[PDB]
C-alpha cells in the first residue's frame, strides 16, 4: 500500500509519525521505505528499529497481561483473546523478519549495518520465542541464538568495544541468555565482560561518544544488579 | 465482524482489552456489543465511553502535534499526513455518532442513560468541531450545542446536582463553551454555578458518593483556575 509514495516522503512521514507517537503508522511508512529496495542509511535504520520496537512492545505488554490472567484462570474468552494478541504479535515479528530476509541482510556489507540487522533478526526471533511452546520453541530459540552469535562475531572483529551498536547487541544477547535460554551464568558473564571491555576503551572517546556508550553501559550494570 | 461473538463474550473481552491497554480492540468489542441491539447497562455504558475516549484521545493528540508542525511550515507531506490522521479521527467520531443514533439514544428512557448518551453525542460532535473549518464548522458546533443542551435540560430536571454524570456533562459543556464556541464567560458561569450547586448538596451523600462527586468538582475548579 506504500508503493505509490516516494521514498523520501515515506521517511519524512515516518519522522512525523514518531513525533505524533503513531508507531503503527511509523512502521508502515518504514516498511514501505525498505520495500523500495535501496539500502537504508544509519538514520533510516534507527527509524525502522524504533517503529517496530514500539509496535511490538505494545503487543508484548498486552500479551503479558492476558497470559497472567489466563494462568490464574487455570469460558474460552481469555484464551481466545490472548491467542488473538499472540497472532498479531507473531505477524509483526514475521513482517520484520521478512524485511531482514528480503533483502536487508544480504545487501548489508558494512559492519555497522550488518550487525544492526542481525541483532534485529535475533530480537524478533526472541519475541517469537517468548510466546512459543514445545520443540517449535526450540528451533525458534536456535534461530535467535544464531543471529545474535553471527552479529557478535562480526562486532568483535570490526567494532570497538564501546560502539553503541556492539554494546546494545551484547545487552540483548545477555537478556536472551537470561530470559529465553535459561543460561543466567552465560548472561552474567557476557554482560560483565562487555561492561569491563567498554570501560577500558572509554578514554578514547569524545564527550558525546562517551555519553552514548556510558548510557548503554548503565543498562548492562542495571541488569547485573537485577541478576546478581 | 463481531456478529458471530456472544454479547457476554464481547463484554468480557472489552474488560480484558481495557486491562491490556488495547483500546482499539476494546472499542471494537463494545461496538459489537451495542450492535446486538439490546440496551446497555451502566457498567457497559462506561466501557463504551472509556474505549472510544482513549481511541479518539490518541488521534486528537496526534492531530495536535501534526497541526502545530503544519502551522509552523506556513512539500505536501505534513498536510497529507495531518489529513490522514484527521480522516481517521472523523471516522471514529462518525462511528460513535452512528451507534448513538442507531439506536442507543432513541431507546434510552431513563435519565441516567439518556443524559449519558446525549453528553457523548455532544463530545463527539465537539471533536469533529475541533478539526472542522468554515461554515461546515458552524452546523457541527450547533449539533454539539444541541446535544449538550438537551442533556443539561434533562439532568437539571431529573438528577441531583451532585450526580457525577450531571457534573461531567456540565464540565464538558463548559469546555465546549470555552474551546469551541468562543464563549469564555458562559464557560466560567456554567462551571461556577455547577460547582456551587454541587457543594451545597454534598451533605446528602455517603462517603463513597462524596468521593465520586468531589473528584469531578475538582476538575471544575481546575478549569476555573485555568480560565480566571
Ligand atoms: O522491560 C523490558 C526490558 O527489556 C529489555 C531490556 C534490555 C534489553 C532488551 C530488552 P527487550 O526485551 O524489550 O528487547 N522490556 C519490556 C518488555 C514488555 C514490552 C515492553 C518492553
Ligand atoms: O487535556 C485535555 C483536557 O480535556 C478535557 C478537560 C475536561 C473535560 C473534557 C475534556 P476533553 O476535551 O478531553 O473531552 N484533553 C486532551 C486533549 C488531547 C487528547 C487527549 C485529551
Ligand atoms: Cl478474541
Ligand atoms: Cl553484501
Ligand atoms: Cl499520509
Ligand atoms: Cl424511550
Ligand atoms: Mg522515486
Ligand atoms: Mg551493500
Ligand atoms: Mg446470544
Ligand atoms: Mg428503554
XYZ file of C-alpha atoms and ligand atoms in Angstrom:
506
model
C 0.000 0.000 0.000
C 3.008 2.427 0.171
C 4.083 1.559 -3.362
C 2.861 4.871 -4.836
C 4.623 7.110 -2.235
C 8.158 8.491 -2.882
C 10.868 7.007 -0.680
C 11.813 10.387 0.719
C 8.105 11.190 1.538
C 7.833 7.839 3.443
C 10.931 8.750 5.514
C 9.629 12.259 6.175
C 6.215 10.836 7.248
C 7.949 8.201 9.497
C 9.622 11.063 11.355
C 6.296 12.919 11.707
C 4.530 9.742 12.957
C 7.338 9.347 15.552
C 6.656 12.970 16.761
C 2.958 12.193 16.918
C 3.579 8.878 18.767
C 1.838 6.991 15.989
C 4.097 3.986 15.844
C 1.907 1.691 13.744
C 1.873 4.408 11.047
C 5.640 4.874 11.578
C 6.221 1.111 10.991
C 4.085 1.021 7.909
C 5.928 4.067 6.399
C 9.344 2.442 7.178
C 8.151 -0.911 5.763
C 7.242 0.999 2.571
C 10.667 2.652 2.541
C 12.527 -0.663 2.886
C 10.340 -2.097 0.099
C 11.744 0.492 -2.316
C 14.748 -1.809 -2.451
C 17.565 0.648 -1.643
C 19.874 0.183 1.363
C 18.982 2.170 4.478
C 21.193 4.868 5.956
C 22.095 4.799 9.692
C 19.342 7.295 10.498
C 16.797 5.258 8.491
C 17.868 2.010 10.251
C 17.154 3.601 13.509
C 13.674 4.813 12.349
C 12.871 1.254 11.320
C 14.028 -0.140 14.699
C 12.187 2.484 16.791
C 8.902 1.979 14.866
C 8.791 -1.812 15.235
C 10.171 -1.853 18.811
C 7.280 0.307 19.904
C 4.638 -1.629 17.949
C 5.830 -4.991 19.265
C 6.408 -3.503 22.733
C 2.656 -2.661 22.906
C 1.751 -6.209 21.822
C 4.239 -7.907 24.226
C 2.960 -5.864 27.160
C -0.636 -6.830 26.286
C 0.253 -10.490 25.803
C 1.868 -10.454 29.249
C -1.223 -9.034 30.962
C -3.502 -11.632 29.171
C -1.125 -14.552 29.810
C -1.065 -13.704 33.545
C -4.868 -13.570 33.659
C -5.067 -16.900 31.774
C -2.592 -18.598 34.132
C -4.665 -17.516 37.141
C -7.772 -18.870 35.378
C -6.051 -22.308 35.257
C -15.079 -19.914 29.381
C -12.765 -19.783 26.324
C -12.649 -15.933 26.165
C -9.320 -15.301 27.971
C -7.516 -17.914 25.865
C -9.207 -16.647 22.666
C -8.236 -13.101 23.220
C -4.672 -13.977 24.342
C -4.440 -16.033 21.121
C -5.716 -13.022 19.032
C -2.971 -10.755 20.519
C -0.351 -13.537 20.167
C -1.213 -13.980 16.473
C -0.927 -10.288 15.734
C 2.397 -10.174 17.661
C 3.651 -13.107 15.553
C 2.537 -11.372 12.419
C 4.541 -8.218 13.314
C 7.644 -10.351 14.052
C 7.209 -12.227 10.791
C 6.898 -8.933 8.878
C 10.174 -7.612 10.376
C 11.957 -10.943 9.771
C 10.667 -10.823 6.218
C 12.136 -7.374 5.612
C 15.503 -8.511 7.033
C 15.497 -11.558 4.806
C 14.218 -9.702 1.684
C 16.752 -8.249 1.312
C 18.255 -6.041 4.013
C 20.752 -8.540 5.480
C 22.036 -9.870 2.200
C 22.859 -6.373 0.868
C 24.452 -5.108 4.131
C 28.250 -5.259 3.628
C 29.429 -2.737 6.238
C 29.832 -3.894 9.813
C 27.574 -1.206 11.297
C 24.683 -2.246 9.054
C 25.208 -5.969 9.107
C 25.479 -6.138 12.943
C 22.401 -3.838 13.276
C 20.213 -6.099 11.099
C 21.469 -9.362 12.622
C 20.786 -8.038 16.124
C 17.211 -7.148 14.891
C 16.858 -10.682 13.500
C 17.908 -12.045 16.995
C 15.460 -9.707 18.810
C 12.420 -10.571 16.647
C 13.057 -14.375 16.872
C 13.458 -13.811 20.633
C 9.954 -12.183 20.721
C 8.619 -15.160 18.774
C 10.308 -17.401 21.361
C 8.612 -15.652 24.277
C 5.165 -16.849 23.066
C 6.281 -20.172 21.562
C 5.838 -23.597 23.160
C 7.431 -27.087 22.923
C 10.010 -28.018 20.275
C 8.704 -25.422 17.907
C 10.081 -23.209 20.575
C 13.485 -24.974 20.157
C 14.115 -24.096 16.515
C 12.962 -20.507 17.207
C 15.401 -20.181 20.127
C 18.156 -21.593 17.938
C 17.345 -19.100 15.185
C 17.576 -16.198 17.696
C 20.872 -17.660 19.036
C 22.349 -17.999 15.555
C 21.539 -14.403 14.542
C 22.947 -12.868 17.761
C 26.060 -15.091 17.514
C 26.786 -14.083 13.935
C 26.321 -10.402 14.954
C 28.607 -10.841 17.997
C 31.357 -12.414 15.859
C 31.283 -9.579 13.406
C 31.057 -6.911 16.143
C 34.115 -8.236 17.944
C 36.208 -8.329 14.753
C 35.049 -4.996 13.364
C 33.898 -2.523 16.058
C 35.473 -1.023 19.140
C 34.158 -2.323 22.450
C 32.464 0.995 23.144
C 30.493 1.136 19.859
C 26.817 1.549 20.941
C 25.529 -0.983 18.433
C 28.022 -3.583 19.749
C 27.002 -2.708 23.340
C 23.274 -2.952 22.697
C 23.791 -6.272 20.862
C 25.620 -7.671 23.856
C 22.946 -6.305 26.200
C 20.120 -8.018 24.172
C 22.043 -11.244 23.780
C 22.601 -11.337 27.568
C 18.821 -10.880 28.016
C 18.252 -13.730 25.548
C 20.554 -15.947 27.657
C 18.845 -14.956 30.923
C 15.194 -14.941 29.765
C 14.961 -17.417 26.996
C 17.857 -19.863 27.077
C 17.785 -20.485 30.850
C 21.523 -19.645 30.947
C 21.816 -16.975 33.652
C 25.541 -17.593 34.118
C 26.192 -17.016 30.393
C 24.058 -13.858 30.731
C 26.010 -12.531 33.646
C 29.397 -13.434 32.078
C 28.504 -11.690 28.854
C 27.210 -8.575 30.470
C 30.221 -8.277 32.839
C 32.855 -8.863 30.125
C 31.082 -6.387 27.831
C 30.916 -3.730 30.582
C 34.604 -4.182 31.575
C 35.924 -4.101 27.975
C 33.952 -0.958 27.240
C 35.120 0.797 30.444
C 38.738 0.226 29.408
C 38.072 1.843 25.933
C 36.204 4.961 27.245
C 39.418 7.035 27.369
C 39.398 7.035 23.546
C 36.043 8.765 23.198
C 34.893 12.348 22.771
C 32.426 13.817 25.208
C 29.435 12.933 23.004
C 30.577 9.365 22.224
C 31.299 8.886 25.974
C 27.692 9.861 26.802
C 26.279 7.431 24.159
C 28.467 4.492 25.338
C 28.058 5.003 29.065
C 24.248 5.164 28.728
C 24.195 1.583 27.416
C 26.847 0.536 29.930
C 24.404 1.646 32.640
C 21.755 -0.727 31.182
C 24.310 -3.553 31.400
C 25.052 -2.581 35.010
C 21.309 -2.414 35.856
C 20.852 -5.967 34.597
C 23.852 -7.330 36.501
C 22.309 -5.724 39.586
C 18.940 -7.399 38.830
C 20.741 -10.749 38.158
C 23.222 -10.934 40.977
C -17.052 -8.573 12.206
C -18.255 -9.184 15.832
C -21.576 -10.577 14.640
C -20.661 -14.198 15.467
C -19.476 -13.471 19.066
C -21.905 -13.738 22.042
C -22.798 -10.425 23.661
C -21.479 -11.526 27.026
C -18.136 -12.697 25.439
C -17.751 -9.232 23.771
C -18.249 -7.526 27.171
C -15.823 -9.902 28.875
C -13.213 -9.289 26.110
C -13.763 -5.462 26.353
C -12.808 -5.678 30.025
C -9.704 -7.757 29.205
C -8.663 -5.310 26.430
C -9.027 -2.455 28.977
C -6.634 -4.356 31.368
C -4.225 -4.877 28.500
C -4.481 -1.194 27.417
C -5.686 -2.272 23.998
C -8.277 0.397 23.443
C -8.857 -0.096 19.715
C -9.747 -3.742 20.469
C -11.851 -2.535 23.436
C -13.812 -0.161 21.120
C -14.381 -2.794 18.511
C -15.686 -5.298 21.153
C -18.040 -2.604 22.608
C -19.190 -1.610 19.092
C -20.052 -5.303 18.559
C -21.916 -5.385 21.873
C -24.010 -2.304 21.037
C -24.771 -3.839 17.621
C -26.507 -6.762 19.336
C -29.387 -4.335 19.735
C -30.033 -4.607 23.494
C -29.806 -1.589 25.823
C -26.535 -1.181 27.715
C -26.249 -1.367 31.488
C -24.452 1.421 33.432
C -21.247 -0.620 33.577
C -21.440 -1.341 29.822
C -22.045 2.377 29.045
C -18.926 3.207 30.846
C -16.905 0.526 28.934
C -18.137 2.037 25.684
C -17.162 5.577 26.788
C -13.706 4.578 28.096
C -12.856 2.632 24.895
C -13.724 5.437 22.468
C -12.352 8.249 24.683
C -8.969 6.584 24.625
C -9.030 5.799 20.892
C -10.044 9.341 19.953
C -7.711 10.783 22.609
C -4.748 9.147 20.776
C -5.942 10.582 17.444
C -6.617 14.105 18.854
C -3.179 14.235 20.461
C -1.573 13.198 17.149
C -3.646 15.667 15.141
C -2.496 18.413 17.512
C 1.198 17.600 17.068
C 0.787 17.491 13.199
C -1.348 20.655 13.071
C 1.317 22.550 15.067
C 4.055 21.343 12.714
C 1.919 22.323 9.686
C 1.223 25.812 11.070
C 4.956 26.401 11.555
C 5.523 25.198 7.974
C 3.183 28.013 6.791
C 6.316 19.685 0.265
C 2.764 18.308 0.718
C 3.784 15.601 3.267
C 2.866 17.396 6.535
C -0.570 18.366 5.205
C -1.098 14.865 3.735
C -0.297 13.103 6.909
C -2.295 15.555 9.082
C -5.202 14.918 6.674
C -4.746 11.082 7.038
C -4.958 11.364 10.880
C -7.865 13.859 10.631
C -9.822 11.463 8.392
C -9.348 8.536 10.729
C -10.345 10.765 13.699
C -13.504 11.781 11.799
C -14.242 8.181 11.038
C -14.052 7.235 14.758
C -16.376 10.152 15.658
C -18.793 9.157 12.918
C -18.799 5.545 14.164
C -19.666 6.649 17.735
C -22.332 9.091 16.483
C -23.727 6.268 14.387
C -24.057 3.966 17.389
C -25.805 6.732 19.374
C -28.209 7.353 16.530
C -28.787 3.628 15.746
C -30.322 3.180 18.218
C -28.904 3.913 21.664
C -30.448 7.371 22.202
C -33.892 6.526 20.937
C -34.237 3.511 23.275
C -32.807 5.289 26.371
C -35.802 6.248 28.566
C -34.121 6.606 31.973
C -32.425 9.876 32.814
C -29.058 8.303 33.663
C -28.855 6.638 30.250
C -30.347 9.388 28.164
C -28.080 12.112 29.667
C -25.021 9.792 29.293
C -25.642 9.226 25.561
C -26.533 12.856 24.806
C -23.360 14.038 26.543
C -21.423 11.500 24.330
C -23.193 12.897 21.254
C -22.059 16.458 22.353
C -18.454 15.284 22.972
C -18.042 13.503 19.606
C -19.523 16.457 17.605
C -17.166 18.670 19.648
C -14.184 16.517 18.462
C -15.466 16.859 14.902
C -15.642 20.624 15.501
C -12.020 20.813 16.635
C -10.809 19.759 13.142
C -13.600 21.397 11.122
C -13.321 24.656 9.178
C -15.665 27.390 7.835
C -19.464 27.092 7.916
C -19.299 23.347 7.883
C -17.814 24.016 11.238
C -20.985 26.015 12.144
C -23.525 23.215 11.769
C -21.156 20.850 13.635
C -20.828 23.310 16.537
C -24.598 23.699 16.588
C -25.060 19.926 16.667
C -22.670 19.662 19.668
C -24.525 22.575 21.361
C -27.924 20.979 20.800
C -26.902 17.596 22.256
C -25.290 19.101 25.392
C -28.293 21.436 25.871
C -30.817 18.618 25.667
C -28.679 16.620 28.167
C -28.405 19.637 30.512
C -32.189 20.168 30.472
C -32.854 16.589 31.369
C -30.076 16.490 34.002
C -31.422 19.539 35.804
C -34.980 18.158 35.915
C -34.045 14.597 36.829
C -30.719 14.315 38.713
C -29.322 15.807 41.884
C -26.659 18.464 41.411
C -24.001 16.116 42.746
C -24.744 13.244 40.320
C -21.373 12.523 38.594
C -22.916 12.205 35.148
C -24.587 15.632 35.560
C -21.264 17.076 36.815
C -19.191 15.655 33.977
C -21.784 16.884 31.444
C -21.526 20.385 32.840
C -17.723 20.155 32.870
C -17.636 19.111 29.137
C -20.227 21.665 28.124
C -18.165 24.394 29.848
C -15.123 23.194 27.846
C -17.235 23.346 24.675
C -18.137 26.972 25.511
C -14.514 27.907 26.271
C -12.749 25.994 23.461
C -15.172 25.796 20.642
C -17.881 28.431 20.956
C -15.560 31.316 21.913
C -17.811 31.974 24.945
C -15.411 32.014 27.906
C -17.868 33.909 30.108
C -20.570 31.266 29.517
C -17.891 28.658 30.326
C -16.917 30.276 33.567
C -20.559 30.922 34.599
C -21.505 27.327 33.955
C -18.583 25.852 35.764
C -19.018 28.146 38.814
C -22.791 27.587 39.133
C -22.293 23.827 38.743
C -19.551 23.763 41.413
C -21.586 25.879 43.899
C -24.822 23.869 43.465
C -22.961 20.615 43.969
C -21.124 21.885 47.086
C -24.473 22.725 48.687
C -25.780 19.123 48.013
C -22.659 17.266 49.334
C -24.146 16.930 52.845
C -26.630 14.410 51.400
C -24.004 11.947 50.216
C -22.369 8.851 51.661
C -18.617 8.676 51.928
C -18.272 6.897 48.566
C -20.684 9.186 46.673
C -18.881 12.207 48.236
C -15.549 10.955 46.829
C -17.061 10.440 43.319
C -18.718 13.914 43.256
C -15.841 15.888 44.722
C -13.384 14.364 42.212
C -15.325 15.938 39.331
C -15.837 19.139 41.317
C -12.036 19.397 41.466
C -11.903 19.236 37.628
C -14.406 22.115 37.520
C -12.255 24.055 39.997
C -9.069 23.327 37.979
C -10.688 24.791 34.871
C -11.938 27.915 36.648
C -8.357 28.362 37.852
C -7.052 27.959 34.266
C -9.779 30.375 32.988
C -9.706 33.132 35.543
O 11.160 -4.288 30.448
C 11.727 -4.600 29.392
C 13.283 -4.706 29.398
O 13.604 -5.465 28.181
C 14.888 -5.356 27.662
C 15.917 -4.917 28.500
C 17.212 -4.796 27.954
C 17.414 -5.098 26.606
C 16.365 -5.511 25.744
C 15.095 -5.567 26.310
P 13.648 -6.150 25.302
O 13.197 -7.481 25.804
O 12.500 -5.088 25.388
O 14.195 -6.250 23.808
N 11.093 -4.784 28.244
C 9.635 -4.626 28.103
C 9.035 -5.996 27.870
C 7.495 -5.801 27.716
C 7.216 -4.962 26.459
C 7.847 -3.587 26.540
C 9.342 -3.692 26.934
O -6.191 17.881 28.088
C -7.370 17.578 27.858
C -8.472 18.141 28.807
O -9.726 17.961 28.061
C -10.916 17.946 28.777
C -10.941 18.518 30.052
C -12.153 18.481 30.774
C -13.267 17.865 30.201
C -13.236 17.252 28.922
C -12.008 17.266 28.267
P -11.852 16.551 26.561
O -11.629 17.652 25.578
O -10.672 15.521 26.541
O -13.236 15.807 26.292
N -7.740 16.751 26.892
C -6.778 16.093 25.990
C -6.945 16.692 24.610
C -5.923 15.976 23.674
C -6.290 14.487 23.573
C -6.241 13.795 24.920
C -7.048 14.593 25.976
Cl -10.830 -12.635 20.506
Cl 26.949 -7.564 0.729
Cl -0.136 10.187 4.504
Cl -37.520 5.514 25.113
Mg 11.127 7.827 -6.585
Mg 25.745 -3.097 0.381
Mg -26.578 -14.789 22.157
Mg -35.521 1.848 27.134
